[PDB]
Design a protein around this nucleic acid. Sequence first.
DNA 1: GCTATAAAAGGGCA
DNA 2: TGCCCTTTTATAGC
Length: 186
Amino acid sequence: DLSKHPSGIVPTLQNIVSTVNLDCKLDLKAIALQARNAEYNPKRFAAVIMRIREPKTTALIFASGKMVCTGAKSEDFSKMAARKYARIVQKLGFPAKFKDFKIQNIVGSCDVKFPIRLEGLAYSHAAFSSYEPELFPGLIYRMKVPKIVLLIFVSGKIVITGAKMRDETYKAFENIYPVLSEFRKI
DNA sequence: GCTATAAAAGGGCA
DNA sequence: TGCCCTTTTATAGC
């Protein structure tokens, strides 16, 4: 679909983090006792860690009724999964609602299929680049428009994070594509 | 398994 | 007051 993706490449979404407000105070101890699919070491982290198989995700349930859903491959799957946790808490006897569901971060990745001269890229876009190969092999490109972070590897493989809307993921990628080509490694 | 990246939630502690 | 922690995921190196 070249009209939307002129590069002819569409980043595949890998992880969605969403949050929602169950709207009631929760008893984390009771929940970890009753819950089966739930983990809870208050000493290590203040939340019950619960997981479901479909959509395969992990939820962090807090005493406040606030919740973080993680691991889904799309926004709808993220909402669905958050909804499943809500019913699990409702059925544990808590009046869980579903308030202010919000997608907080979308992670995508794609492959341009040509290698990149990272040091060159880093040198010419130094105001956005951060590249210490001896520490981490990818170059961190913090794009300003949209405010997105791309991890660029010499392999031609790229990771795009920090999006709240999938179109930001798509645009950051289309924005970086002519740049990747400019620094293709021959 | 562990360098790095985004993001949310909240308890502890300096 | 504010950071670290915990969780997820692609990527690639030690």
